[PDB]
Structures are given as structure tokens and as C-alpha cells.
Write a protein that binds this ligand. Structure first.
Ligand code: NA
Length: 187
């Protein structure tokens, strides 16, 4: 359980394999290691594949089935929907640029406008954690000038979740997809 500073992305991935070797997750240790990694753009350029119209998810590592490590690429003004995480852990670290996280409570069955518990401005190398026990959230790149890049870890992996309309609180089932896997573009 000796946590060391990841010196490279590859080194980080090797450490993460160790932390997820078991059946349980020490959230604070996983988070400390993600934060300790200093983003080196050359190490992840292979995965940072952008799309003009919306943010992309780019698979980096399947964590031997225990988690998915992915890189998300956000153009100017690109955001996600209000999402849940399908009963899994969800770590977020900024690699480049800024993202705004907005937290939302689980809604009632009564159609009502969802209200923002809070929000925070995530900056380079910072890390956020969320799970359904905590609540829901939206992630956005509100910048007009700088693309954003983040590293995400989900455990267990999930390819389906729910999106929430902020006006009613109504949820609909969504399937996630990858823009690339292992640096390979996948239609
Ligand atoms: Na959630």
C-alpha cells in the first residue's frame, strides 16, 4: 500500500493496476495518485482526439476488467449532460485547460427544475471524485478559447448511464461510446 508519485502516464497506469488488484477501492488513495501525476502532454497526445461538435471519450486502459481509464477531449463550449454513474466510482483529473463541474441532487418524481447544489472550477492537474451516493453532475468547458483535456477513471466500467433534463428532472437511458481505443479511431 506504499503510494508513490507516478513519474509518467505509463507509470500511473501501472500503479492503478495495483490499487485495483482487489475487490474494493480506496478512493482517497486513487485520488491522491491521480493528483500526483503531473500532466505531460506528449504522454497522452495519442489519445487526445477531438471532435468538432461534442466532447469525445478515448479509452486508454481497461484496468484488467476492474476499471476503464479514458481521456476526454472538450472543444470550446462542449459540455456533457447531467449524468449519473451507474453505481460506479468516477475520478476526473484535468490534463489541460479548465472545466466547470456542476453538482445536482437526485430529483423527485415530480417534474421540477433541477437546482444546482454547487459548482466548482477545476484547474490543471486537479482531481474531482463523484458517485451516485454523492449526487449527479455536469462537466463543461465554458472557455471560448481553450480546448480542455481530462483523464477519467470509472470502476467498475460502464457504457450506459442516465441523462437528466435540468428542466423537468426527467431521466432517459443513454449508451456511451468511445471515439477511440488505444489511440485507434473506432467508428
Ligand atoms: Na453519479
Amino acid at each position: 500500500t506504499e503510494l508513490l508519485k507516478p513519474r509518467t502516464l505509463a507509470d500511473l497506469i501501472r500503479i492503478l493496476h495495483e490499487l485495483f488488484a482487489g475487490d474494493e477501492v480506496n478512493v482517497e488513495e486513487v485520488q491522491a495518485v491521480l493528483e500526483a501525476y503531473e500532466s505531460n502532454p506528449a504522454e497522452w497526445a495519442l489519445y487526445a482526439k477531438f471532435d468538432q461538435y461534442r466532447y469525445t471519450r478515448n479509452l486508454v486502459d481497461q484496468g484488467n476488467g476492474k476499471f476503464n481509464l479514458m481521456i476526454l477531449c472538450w472543444g470550446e463550449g462542449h459540455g456533457s449532460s447531467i449524468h449519473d454513474h451507474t453505481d460506479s466510482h468516477c475520478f476526473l483529473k484535468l490534463l489541460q485547460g479548465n472545466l466547470k463541474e456542476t453538482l445536482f441532487d437526485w430529483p423527485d418524481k415530480k417534474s421540477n427544475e433541477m437546482i444546482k447544489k454547487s459548482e466548482r472550477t477545476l484547474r490543471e492537474n486537479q482531481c474531482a471524485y463523484i458517485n451516485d451516493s454523492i449526487g449527479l453532475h455536469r462537466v463543461e468547458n465554458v472557455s471560448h478559447t481553450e480546448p480542455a483535456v481530462s483523464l477519467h477513471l470509472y470502476s467498475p466500467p460502464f457504457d450506459t448511464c442516465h441523462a437528466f433534463d435540468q428542466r423537468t428532472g426527467h431521466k432517459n437511458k443513454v449508451t456511451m461510446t468511445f471515439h477511440s481505443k488505444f489511440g485507434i479511431r473506432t467508428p
